[PDB]
Amino acid sequence: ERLKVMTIFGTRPEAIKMAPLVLELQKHPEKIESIVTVTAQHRQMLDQVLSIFGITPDFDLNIMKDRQTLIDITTRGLEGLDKVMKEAKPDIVLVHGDTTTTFIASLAAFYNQIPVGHVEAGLRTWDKYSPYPEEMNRQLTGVMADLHFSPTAKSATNLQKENKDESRIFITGNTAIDALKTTVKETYSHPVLEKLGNNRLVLMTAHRRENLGEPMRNMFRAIKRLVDKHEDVQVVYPVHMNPVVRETANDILGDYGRIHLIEPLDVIDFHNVAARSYLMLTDSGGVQEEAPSLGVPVLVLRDTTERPEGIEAGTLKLAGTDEETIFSLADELLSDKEAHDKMSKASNPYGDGRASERIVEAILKHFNK
Amino acid sequence: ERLKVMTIFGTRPEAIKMAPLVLELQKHPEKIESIVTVTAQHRQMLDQVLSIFGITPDFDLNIMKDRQTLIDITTRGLEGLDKVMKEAKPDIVLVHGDTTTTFIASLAAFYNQIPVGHVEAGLRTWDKYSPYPEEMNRQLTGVMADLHFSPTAKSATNLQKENKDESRIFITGNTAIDALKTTVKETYSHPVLEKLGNNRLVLMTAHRRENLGEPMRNMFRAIKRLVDKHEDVQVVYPVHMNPVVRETANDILGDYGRIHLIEPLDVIDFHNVAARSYLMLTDSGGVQEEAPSLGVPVLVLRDTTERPEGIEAGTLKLAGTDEETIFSLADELLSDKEAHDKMSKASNPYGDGRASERIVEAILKHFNK
Numbered sequence: 001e002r003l004k005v006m007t008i009f010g011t012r013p014e015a016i017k018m019a020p021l022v023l024e025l026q027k028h029p030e031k032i033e034s035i036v037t038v039t040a041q042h043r044q045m046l047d048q049v050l051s052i053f054g055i056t057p058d059f060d061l062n063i064m065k066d067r068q069t070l071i072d073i074t075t076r077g078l079e080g081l082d083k084v085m086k087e088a089k090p091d092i093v094l095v096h097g098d099t100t101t102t103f104i105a106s107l108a109a110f111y112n113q114i115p116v117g118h119v120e121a122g123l124r125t126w127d128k129y130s131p132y133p134e135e136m137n138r139q140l141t142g143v144m145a146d147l148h149f150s151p152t153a154k155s156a157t158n159l160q161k162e163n164k165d166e167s168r169i170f171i172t173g174n175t176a177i178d179a180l181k182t183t184v185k186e187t188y189s190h191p192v193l194e195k196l197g198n199n200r201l202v203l204m205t206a207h208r209r210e211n212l213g214e215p216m217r218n219m220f221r222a223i224k225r226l227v228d229k230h231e232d233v234q235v236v237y238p239v240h241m242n243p244v245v246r247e248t249a250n251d252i253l254g255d256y257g258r259i260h261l262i263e264p265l266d267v268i269d270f271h272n273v274a275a276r277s278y279l280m281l282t283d284s285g286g287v288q289e290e291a292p293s294l295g296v297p298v299l300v301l302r303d304t305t306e307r308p309e310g311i312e313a314g315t316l317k318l319a320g321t322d323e324e325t326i327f328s329l330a331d332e333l334l335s336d337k338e339a340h341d342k343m344s345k346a347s348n349p350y351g352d353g354r355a356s357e358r359i360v361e362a363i364l365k366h367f368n369k
Numbered sequence: 370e371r372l373k374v375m376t377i378f379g380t381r382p383e384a385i386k387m388a389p390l391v392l393e394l395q396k397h398p399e400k401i402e403s404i405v406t407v408t409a410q411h412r413q414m415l416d417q418v419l420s421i422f423g424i425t426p427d428f429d430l431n432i433m434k435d436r437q438t439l440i441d442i443t444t445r446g447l448e449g450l451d452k453v454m455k456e457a458k459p460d461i462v463l464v465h466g467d468t469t470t471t472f473i474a475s476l477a478a479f480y481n482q483i484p485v486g487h488v489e490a491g492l493r494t495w496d497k498y499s500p501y502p503e504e505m506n507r508q509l510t511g512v513m514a515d516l517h518f519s520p521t522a523k524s525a526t527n528l529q530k531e532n533k534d535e536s537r538i539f540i541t542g543n544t545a546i547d548a549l550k551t552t553v554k555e556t557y558s559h560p561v562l563e564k565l566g567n568n569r570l571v572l573m574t575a576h577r578r579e580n581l582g583e584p585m586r587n588m589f590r591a592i593k594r595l596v597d598k599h600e601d602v603q604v605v606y607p608v609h610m611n612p613v614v615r616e617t618a619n620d621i622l623g624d625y626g627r628i629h630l631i632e633p634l635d636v637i638d639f640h641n642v643a644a645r646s647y648l649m650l651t652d653s654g655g656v657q658e659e660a661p662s663l664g665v666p667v668l669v670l671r672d673t674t675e676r677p678e679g680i681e682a683g684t685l686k687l688a689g690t691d692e693e694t695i696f697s698l699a700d701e702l703l704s705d706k707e708a709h710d711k712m713s714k715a716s717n718p719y720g721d722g723r724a725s726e727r728i729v730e731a732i733l734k735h736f737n738k
C-alpha cells in the first residue's frame with residue numbers, strides 16, 4: 001500500500017522550487033502516490049513550469065489574495081485545504097517556505113492529524129514583525145512540522161536552537177538548484193544568444209529598490225568601460241525602463257550593439273541564458289543561490305550579502321554600488337581566465353542538485369517504506 | 370492616557386484562572402483600562418465566578434463549541450476575535466493556556482500587530498497528538514506571544530530552550546492560587562459540610578476514563594478500609610453517576626453511612642469544601658497545584674507524576690493506583706498528626722497567591738508605564 005504524498009503549490013515562485021521535488025516523487029511509483037494541489041492565484045507561469053516537468057495537478061483551489069485581508073485568506077484557505085485533505089487522505093503534506101498558505105496548509109494537516117514536511121525550513125530574522133507576516137508564518141509552520149528540509153547548516157542550526165528534534169532536521173540543499181537539470185536544454189535558442197557569438201556574455205540584473213538612481217548610473221558607466229576594454233564581451237540587461245531611465249542608459253552606453261537592454265525574461269529563458277553566461281552581476285538573493293551551480297561567477301551589486309556561505313565558498317564576491325568597485329572586480333574576472341575559472345568551479349554551498357532526492361529519502365525512512 | 374488591556378475568558382475553567390488577574394488590573398485605574406472579553410458558550414458558572422470577583426464583561430462573543438468542529442471554532446473564533454480587537458483597539462491582549470480560543474485570539478492579535486501576554490505558558494509534552502489539540506495550541510500561542518507568564522521554573526525553562534527572549538519569560542506562579550483569597554469564605558454552607566459535622570473529611574477526585582477498571586476498584590477498596598479503621602472520617606467522591614459506578618460502588622463501598630458519592634461540585638463549592646478537607650486523594654493537576662495553598666495534604670492517585678516540584682516541596686506524595694499504597698499513605702496521614710501537619714505547613718511551589726501582581730508589574734514595565 002503506497003505512501004500518499006501531497007505537495008502544495010501555493011505561489012508562482014514555488015513552481016520552480018517544488019516541481020523538482022514532485023518529479024523526484026514521481027520516480028517512485030511503486031512506493032509513492034504523488035498528489036499535487038495548486039492553490040496559487042496566478043497560473044500562467046506556474047502552468048508553464050508544471051508542464052515542462054510533466055506534472056498534472058490533482059486539485060486546483062482559487063485562493064484570492066488580490067486586495068484580501070489575512071483573516072479572509074486564513075479562513076477560506078483553511079476550509080479549502082481541509083476539504084482537499086479529507087478527500088485525498090495524504091499520509092504527508094509538503095509545504096514550502098514562509099507563506100500564509102504554507103501556515104494554513106500545515107494547520108489543516110494538523111486538524112486532520114496528517115504529518116507535514118516543511119521544504120525550505122529554518123530561515124530566521126528573530127523579529128516577529130520583519131518580515132510581516134513571513135517570519136511568524138515560518139515559526140508557526142515550524143512548530144507544526146514533522147520533518148524540516150533546511151537548505152543550509154545555518155537554517156538547521158536555527159531550528160536546533162528552538163529545541164527541534166535533530167532527527168527531524170535534514171540539510172538538503174535548495175530544491176531550486178535541482179530544477180536546472182530539467183529547465184536548461186542544450187538545444188536552446190534566444191535572439192539575445194544569436195547576436196552573441198563565441199563572445200563572452202555578461203548577464204546583469206538589478207531590481208532592488210535601493211539600486212535606483214546613482215547605483216544604476218554607476219553600473220551603466222562600469223559596463224561601458226568593460227565593453228570598451230574587452231572587445232569580445234557582450235552585456236545583457238533584462239529590465240523594463242521608464243523612458244527617462246532609457247535615455248540615461250543610451251547617453252552612457254551609446255548604440256554600438258554589444259550591450260542589449262531587453263525585456264525581463266521568464267524563469268526558463270533566464271535559466272538557459274544564465275547557463276551560457278561567462279559572468280553575472282546581480283542584486284538578486286536567488287541568483288546568488290542558483291547561478292553558481294551553472295558554473296557562472298556571481299558579482300553582487302551590494303555592499304553587504306545575506307548569502308555569507310556563497311562568499312566563504314568563493315561562488316560570490318561583493319562588488320558594491322560604486323562605479324570603481326564594479327569596474328574593478330568585473331574587469332579582474334574578464335581579464336584573468338584563471339580567476340574566472342576558479343569561481344566558475346567553486347562548489348555551490350546552497351546545494352548540489354540532489355535536495356529533492358534527500359527529501360524523498362528522508363520521507364521514505366520516516367514512514368518505514 | 371491609559372494602557373488598554375484586554376483579558377480573554379474563553380471557557381468556564383479559565384474564569385477562576387483569569388478573574389484574579391482582572392481584579393489586579395482594576396487596582397490600577399489611573400494607568401490601566403481593563404477590558405474583559407468573554408467568548409465561552411456556557412456562562413452560568415462563568416457569570417457566577419465573575420459576580421463573586423466583581424467583574425462585568427465589556428465584550429461577549431458566543432463561540433459555539435458543543436458538537437462544533439475544530440475548523441468551525443477556528444474560523445468563527447478568528448473572525449469574531451479580529452472584529453472585537455479592531456473595535457476596542459487594545460494595547461495588549463491577555464490569553465490563558467492551551468485552548469483553541471487562546472491560539473486564535475493570539476493569531477487575531479498578531480494580524481493586528483497587538484502584543485500578546487500568555488498566562489500559564491511553557492507546558493510541554495512534545496507530543497502533538499497528546500494532548501490534541503492542546504499541546505500544539507500552546508506551542509502556536511508560544512511563537513506569537515510577547516510576554517510569557519510561566520507557573521514554574523520547569524515551564525520557563527521549556528521556553529528558554531525554544532530560544533524565546535529570556536527578558537519576556539517570567540515565573541509568576543499559578544493565578545488559580547490567587548483566586549482562593551476571594552473564593553474561600555470564612556463561613557460557608559453546603560450539604561457535604563452539614564453531614565460532615567466535626568468528622569475529618571477525605572476528599573477524593575478521580576477522572577473516570579483514566580481510572581476505569583482496576584484503579585477505581587482499588588481506590589474503593591482502600592477508602593473502605595480507611596473508614597473501617599477511622600470512626601471519625603467521611604470520604605466524599607464527587608462523580609457523575611452511571612450504573613457502572615453504582616454497581617462498582619455498592620459492590621465495594623456498601624451502605625455504612627460514611628462514604629458519599631455526590632454530583633460534581635462547581636469550583637466555588639469545591640474550593641470551599643477542599644478548604645475544610647483533612648486530606649485529598651486526587652489525579653487532578655489543578656488540585657495538586659491549588660489544594661496545598663489551603664493547607665490540605667494531597668495524595669496523588671498515579672504511579673508517575675509530571676508535577677515533581679510538589680513532591681520535592683512535600684505538599685504532594687505519590688500514592689499510586691494500587692490499594693495497599695493508597696491505604697497505607699492515607700491511613701498514615703489520618704493516624705499521625707505530625708505527618709499531617711508537616712505536609713500541611715509545606716510551602717506550595719506552584720505559587721504564593723501573588724501571581725497576578727507579578728503579571729501586571731511585568732506588563733507595566735514592558736510598556737514603561
Ligand SMILES: CNS(=O)(=O)c1cnn(-c2ccccc2)c1C
Nearest residue numbers: 205238264265267270284286287
Ligand atoms: C525577471 N527579470 S530577470 O530576467 O532578470 C530574471 C528572471 N529570472 N530571474 C531569477 C532567476 C533565479 C532566481 C531569481 C531570479 C531573474 C533575476
Ligand SMILES: CNS(=O)(=O)c1cnn(-c2ccccc2)c1C
Nearest residue numbers: 574607633634636639653655656
Ligand atoms: C468535577 N469533579 S470535582 O467536583 O471533583 C472538581 C471540581 N473542581 N475540581 C477542580 C478544582 C481545582 C482544579 C481542578 C479541578 C474538581 C476535580
